Amino acid sequence: MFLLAVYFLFFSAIANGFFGRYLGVRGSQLLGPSALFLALLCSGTIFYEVCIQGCSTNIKLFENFVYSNELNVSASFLYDPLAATMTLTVVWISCAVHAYQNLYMRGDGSQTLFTSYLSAFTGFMLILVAGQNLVMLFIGWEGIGVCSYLLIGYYGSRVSAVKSANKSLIVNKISDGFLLGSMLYLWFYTGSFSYCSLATFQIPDVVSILVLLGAIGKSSQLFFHVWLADAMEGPTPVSALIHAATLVTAGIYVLCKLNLHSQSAVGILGAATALMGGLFGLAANDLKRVIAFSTCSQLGYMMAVLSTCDDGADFAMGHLVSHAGFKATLFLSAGLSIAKENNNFLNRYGSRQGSPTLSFATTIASLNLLGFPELGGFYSKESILNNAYINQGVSIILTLATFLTAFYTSKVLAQLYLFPYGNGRQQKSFDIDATTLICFGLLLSEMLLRIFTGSSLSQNMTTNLPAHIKNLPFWVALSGALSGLATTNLFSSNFMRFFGNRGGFDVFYARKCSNVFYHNAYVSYTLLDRGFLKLY
């Protein structure tokens, strides 16, 4: 029963991408959503069996996947509470994205290949989450990396999309290299790759740094966030999957599965990434970019909370699962707005008659991001902010990030709906089928269920804080939202420009790192092999 979900996704991938000539566009519009629905039924069974009823299961497919001398690893799947929760969230979001793609990608030539890549992408994410050993996780990590390369660069005749895919691939190579080094350290000194025997009470700092460096790649933290903003070249369904669940979450999942992180580093890196991402999102004028910077900020919050307390891992995973739903909703709604208006710029959006479902889903997702009380996003974010009070540095930065988050989120909501119409007087239209309505029904259902069921066991446990300190996140969010509605100026033009250039990390890489890389290549080749050592 547990294997079935992975089978359904890989089957949908093979069918759509190898037998699409027979199935057709309509055949992929059937087999994709059907397989994802079946996988949702299996994931729901897994979630009930493991999470609610505390029944972890291990399925060993085969032994001796790698058998060289002492080194021995097997392909085995352990469904633990973290795996069940992530499997459920991933499959729910993927099923929604598959339903969404039926209408969105009708205007794209390869809808069969797109559906195939989406299902293979979901399968590799489930392999990463459910792996019982570090090698299976690496298999999933690389599979999602390759699927992202094949999906971001889907538009090959655009130089920006191919460059965005190359950027993703290179950054992910650097990260998985650090991970491979850490896995080698852990195998050598613990004797196994299985997480049960992997447990080490005291680990040398080197392994901790290598683990963190590996994780900061997929979960785009500071210095490694360049690829996320660029990943906007790909079609909207890809962005929803990568940002909401498949890619950003993997780093957090790795850090939570093996608690080798160092408190000092994770807190500072997280709080910095939260603030920087919020500031970058303030300057952004593309709808899809703002939601990416919001993803960066939220990832910063999840990374930061690990430092605060022992329950930080539970709080981080709880935020991760709460975030995937609303963030997916934000991307799908942004895509539909872009499709309906033929515009990507916030300036040209405005009030216009539309579907009630889409406008409500956008409002509720934005409210969850903002932190509106009595919402799934609110509980998962307050759990972090309240517990971070002990670390004075992390708390102050995270509150400032909450303010900036509220400001941009409110500005975006005002610009997309409240603001008067800003596009031209030309005939534009995108009619929504019942499949899109089902997709939004699924996202809203996830959002509602999250409030009733919660995200962590310790979510509502009392944090012994004065009332003024416990309710401050709300006041900061409200103040930011009010300032964002008024569309006031917060920073001087020098800083607004700085934030628009994203801190100039990419300008540094191009002017110095890329030039050094190609000078090393020039010395290695032109000066030496084909110069000094080449005959006349």
Partner: protein, 155 residues
């Protein structure tokens, strides 16, 4: 310890006799020896028959060690999965045994340049214990952490 040429030629003749006795009856497990040929040679390469037989014995032993390690890992994984949250206290022994097996397998034939595999951080913990004892007795201040009770699930 010195080996005279008379003793060396005597051992060579004995080795030839051992080969002749082995040759008399066919054995399908000739290259999977259960016992080594005992010797006091400076270099094993001197007696080719001893060298090859002992190498085959060492390969047999290493294969057995690798399979034993896999068995130990299977019992540790089962034990860990049965106990639940009591795994740390109840699976200390099984883990200790598994880690010992891993060290034996890796260390026996590591190679000329390979370092000893410190499964369980036993060597590091020992070194820290010695460093602490010396610093405390000599009145020095140790710049290293003190030895730990447990550094891994077992060792």
């Amino acid at each position: 310890t010195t080996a005279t040429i008379e003793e060396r030629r005597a051992f060579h003749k004995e080795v030839l006799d051992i080969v002749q006795s082995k040759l008399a009856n066919k054995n399908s497990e000739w290259a999977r020896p259960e016992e080594p040929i005992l010797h006091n040679l400076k270099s094993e390469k001197e007696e080719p028959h001893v060298y090859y037989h002992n190498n085959n014995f060492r390969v047999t032993r290493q294969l057995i060690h690798f399979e034993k390690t896999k068995i130990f890992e299977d019992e540790l994984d089962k034990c860990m999965r049965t106990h639940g949250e009591a795994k740390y206290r109840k699976c200390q022994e099984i883990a200790k045994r598994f880690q010992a097996s891993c060290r034996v397998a890796s260390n026996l034939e590591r190679g000329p340049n390979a370092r000893k595999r410190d499964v369980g951080f036993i060597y590091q913990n020992n070194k820290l214990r010695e460093l602490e004892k010396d610093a405390k007795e000599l009145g020095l201040n140790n710049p290293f952490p003190p030895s730990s009770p447990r550094t891994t699930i077992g060792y």
